[PDB]
Amino acid sequence: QVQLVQSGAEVKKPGASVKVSCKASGYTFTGYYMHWVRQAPGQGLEWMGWINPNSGGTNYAQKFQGRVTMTRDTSISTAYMELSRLRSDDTAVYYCARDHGSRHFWSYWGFDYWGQGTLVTVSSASTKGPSVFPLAPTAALGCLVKDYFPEPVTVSWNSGALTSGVHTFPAVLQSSGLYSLSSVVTVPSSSLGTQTYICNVNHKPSNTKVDKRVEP
Amino acid sequence: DIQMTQSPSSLSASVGDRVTITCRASQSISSYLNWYQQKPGKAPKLLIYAASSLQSGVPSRFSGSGSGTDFTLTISSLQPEDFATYYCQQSYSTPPTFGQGTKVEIKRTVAAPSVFIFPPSDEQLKSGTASVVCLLNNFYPREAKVQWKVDNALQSGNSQESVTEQDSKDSTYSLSSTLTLSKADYEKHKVYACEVTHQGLSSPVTKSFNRGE
Amino acid sequence: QPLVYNKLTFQLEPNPHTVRACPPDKMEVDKNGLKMCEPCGGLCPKACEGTGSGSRFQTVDSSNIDGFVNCTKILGNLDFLITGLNGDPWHKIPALDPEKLNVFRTVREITGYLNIQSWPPHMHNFSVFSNLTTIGGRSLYNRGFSLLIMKNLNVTSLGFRSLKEISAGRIYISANRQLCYHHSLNWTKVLRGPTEERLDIKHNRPRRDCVAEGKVCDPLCSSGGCWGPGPGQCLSCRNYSRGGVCVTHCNFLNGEPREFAHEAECFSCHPECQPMEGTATCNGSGSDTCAQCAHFRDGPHCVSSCPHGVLGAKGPIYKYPDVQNECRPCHENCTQGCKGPELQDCL
Ligand SMILES: *[C@@H]1O[C@H](CO)[C@@H](O[C@@H]2O[C@H](CO)[C@@H](O)[C@H](O)[C@H]2NC(C)=O)[C@H](O)[C@H]1NC(C)=O
Ligand SMILES: *[C@@H]1O[C@H](CO)[C@@H](O[C@@H]2O[C@H](CO)[C@@H](O)[C@H](O)[C@H]2NC(C)=O)[C@H](O)[C@H]1NC(C)=O
Ligand SMILES: *[C@@H]1O[C@H](CO)[C@@H](O)[C@H](O)[C@H]1NC(C)=O
Ligand SMILES: *[C@@H]1O[C@H](CO)[C@@H](O)[C@H](O)[C@H]1NC(C)=O
Ligand SMILES: *[C@@H]1O[C@H](CO)[C@@H](O)[C@H](O)[C@H]1NC(C)=O
Fold first, then answer.
1. From C106, C128, C160, C161, mutation site for ligand 4 pocket: most ligand atoms within 8 A of C-beta
2. Could you name the CATH architecture of B1-107?
3. Which of A83, B102, C174, C194 has the smallest C-beta neighbourhood within 10 Å, fewest atoms?
4. Which residues are noted as glycosylation sites (chain C)?
C-alpha cells in the first residue's frame, strides 16, 4: 500500500535551518508531485510548495520563496524540504502530501496520502528538564509539570496502573519560553490516604525521569 | 490569493444529524475545491475532490456540491468516526488556500463543573515562584468563565487556561486555570479564590483557601 | 405596395395602407410586431450545439464534424482532443479528414471555450476560424480557461483574424514550440480586462528566434499585435482597413471606388455621387452625404432620375429636371409628367 514516512521531530534556534525528509513507498515515486503543507499548533493549514519528483521542478509559495529548498532522491524515493532562515512563527508540524494525479495539468491538487508529520519547534530557549510539583487535595489530586523545553512530556500515574479519570492538560507556552503542564486525576476520597498516588513525568529531550509522591 | 471562508466555525451536533458546512471563495474558482477531515493529532484525510467527486474509501454519506463561489460539504447521519475538523481547499490559483475549518462537536446535556483549587506546593516555594491551580473537571458546554480573587481583588494578565478535548465517553470538557506569582507576591495576601461562572451552575461557585492553613 | 413617396422628406417611406416559412436565404425578423423575412448577409444565422461538458460529444471527430456545416454560432464549446484528430486504433476509429475542418469558417461566435490540443500537421494556422469574432466564455475548460492551445508543434501563427473580444476566462497558449506572432498581442483589448494572471503563455518559440527570422508583425499593424503575417492578420490597423485588411489609406481623392472614413475603416460611397478629383467625395455612405450629385438631385438626395409617376400620399408624383438638374415639382393640374413648371409644359 501507499505510505509516506517522514523524519523525526526537530528543535531549532531562530536563524538555523531544518531539513525534513519524506520517504515514499508503495507507488511510482516519480509519477505524482510531492506537496509540502505545514500546520501551526492549533491553527489551520498552510501550503508551502510542491516538487516534481521526475524533473526536479519546484513551485514555492511567495511567503517562503527565497528560504525553502525542496529536493528529491529518486534512488531511494525520498523528498526533502529545507526551510532555512527560521523564525518563531515557523513552529509547526510539516506534512508531505502527494498529488493524486499523474498528469499534473488536469490534477485537482487533492492530497490523498500524507506523511506522519514532523514537529519542528523553533524557539530561542534551551533544552530544560521539567520541575514536578505536587497538587495535593471524591478527592482530586494531580501534578504540575512546570518550566520545561521542548515538547513533549509523557505523564503517567502509578507507572500506568491508574488511567481512569486522568486528565493531562495540553501544555501552555509561558512568556519565559517554557511549557507549563498540569496532570490531575480524580480518586475516591476513601482511598485518599490508603493508596499511594505517584505521577511519573518523562522528558526525553533532556533525559529527565522524575517521580513524585502526592500526599495530603 | 483567493481566501476561503468556512461557516460555521464550530458546530454542535449529535449522532444521526445532517450537518452542512459552507466554503465560500473570494473569487470564482470554477469547480476546483476539495474537502478534508482532520482527526485530532492525525494528518488530514481527503473526502471530496473536484467539488463533488467522492474519494475512494470515504463512505457514501459524504457528499459535496456547488460551483463557482459557494461550495457545500453535506454529510447525512453523523457517525462517531465523523467528529473531527473539516477543511476546504481551493486548487484554482497557484497557491492552494485552505479554510479556517469547521469543528463538529458531540451534542450533550448541560453538565456543571467540579471546581477544585490547589495551593502551591512547598517544594515550589523553595524555588521562588508560586502557581495556584483552579480545576474545572467534566462539564458541558465548553464555554466558561474563571476570575481570580486575591483578597477580593480582581486579577488579570497573570493567569492562563488550558482546555481538554471532548472525552471519549461522557463527551465533557476539562479546564485548568493557573495563576503564576513570585514568592514575594504570594506571601503578601491571605485569601486566594477563583470564581467560576457556568451555564450548569445555578450561581457562580468560588473555591477559597488561606496561605499556611 | 410597401413604399410611398413623400413630398416633405423627398424619399420613399413605408406605406401604412399596404403564415409561411421564410426561404433559406432570408431570416424571419420582427419589425415592431410585423413578421417579415430579411435577406442574410451571406450565410443565415444558425445556432449549433457544442462539445465538452453538457453535450454528448467529448471531442470533435469524424462522426460529428459534418453536423457543423453552415454553423455561425456554437451554443457551447469546441474541443479538439488528440483522439478526435488522429483517431483511435484501439476502437478502429479513422482519423479526422483535415479538409472537413473548413466547416468552421462560418463560425462567428462561440458561447463557451475553445480547447485546441491537436491539429493536422499540414495546417500551420487556425485560419479555419478566420470568421470567429467573439469567444464568450460562459462555460470554461479546466482552470477557468476560455482559450486553450497546448502542444500544437506545427502551428506557425494563430490565425484568428477577426477575433476581437473574449468576454471572460483565462488564456493558455503553451508548448507550441514553433508558434510566433503571438508575443506582441495586446490581450488587454481582447479580454476587456487587466490581464491579472489571466495569461498562461510559455514554452512556445522564443521571441529572440521569431524576431531574428523576420517573422514579426506587419508594419501596417499597430501596437495591438498581429495574428500572423500580412496586412490582414492584424488586430488593429495603423491607419485604415478595407475589408478587414489593413491599408495605408482609403480612397478619398483617388481610387477605383471612392471611399470615406468611419472609425478608421474604408467604406465605398453611394454610386449616385460624382467622383471628385483631388477633393473629398462624400461624408458617409448615404446618397445625401455626397459632395456633387452624379446626375440629379431630389431634395437632399442625389437620384438617378426625377420622380416620374411614383405613388405618393395623394397620388402620382411628377417632377421635372431643373436647369441645374434639381428635381422640381410639375404643375398640380397636370397628368403624365411635364417638361417645366409652366402649365403648357405638360404631357
Ligand atoms: C497557414 O498555413 C499554411 C500552411 O499550413 C501556409 O501556407 C499555405 O499553405 C497552403 C496549403 O498548404 C497553400 O495553398 C498556400 O499557398 C500557402 N501559403 C503560402 C503563402 O505559401 C499559409 O501561408 C498560412 N497562412 C497564414 C496567413 O500565415
Ligand atoms: C493595449 O490596449 C489597452 C486597452 O485597449 C491600452 O490601455 C489603455 O488605453 C486607453 C486608451 O484609450 C487608456 O485610457 C487606458 O488608461 C489604458 N489602460 C492601461 C492599463 O494602459 C494599451 O495602451 C494598449 N497597448 C498597446 C501597446 O497598444
Ligand atoms: C448551407 O448553405 C448553402 C448556401 O449558403 C446551401 O446551398 C446548403 O444547402 C446549406 N447546407 C445546409 C446543410 O444547410
Ligand atoms: C466570413 O464572413 C464574410 C463576411 O463577414 C463572408 O463574406 C464569408 O462568406 C464568410 N466565410 C464563409 C466561409 O462563409
Ligand atoms: C509536423 O511536425 C513534425 C515534428 O514537429 C515535423 O517533422 C513535420 O515536418 C511537421 N509537418 C509539416 C507539414 O511541416
1. C106
2. Sandwich (2.60)
3. C194
4. 70, 125, 131, 154, 186, 239, 283, 333
